[PDB]
């Protein structure tokens, strides 16, 4: 479960990050 | 990574839940 905890919070800084450069 | 991703924070949860018992 905090693997997969650790996935879903990269994907969310990919998603920030990307709406930041939007 | 995501390995040592999910032991922090398992151990920030630790650590949180004894300050709020505190
Ligand atoms: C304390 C409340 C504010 C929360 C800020 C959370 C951090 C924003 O997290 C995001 O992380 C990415 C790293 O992968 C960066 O590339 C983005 O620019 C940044 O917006
Ligand atoms: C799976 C969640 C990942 C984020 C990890 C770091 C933040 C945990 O935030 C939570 O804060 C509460 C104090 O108000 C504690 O009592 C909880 O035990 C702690 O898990």
Redesign the interface.
């Known amino acids: 479960p ?2 997969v ?3 879903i ?2 994907i969310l800084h990919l998603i920030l990050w990307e709406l930041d450069r939007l």
Chains 1, 2 share one sequence.
């Open positions: 905090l693997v905890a650790a996935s919070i990269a």
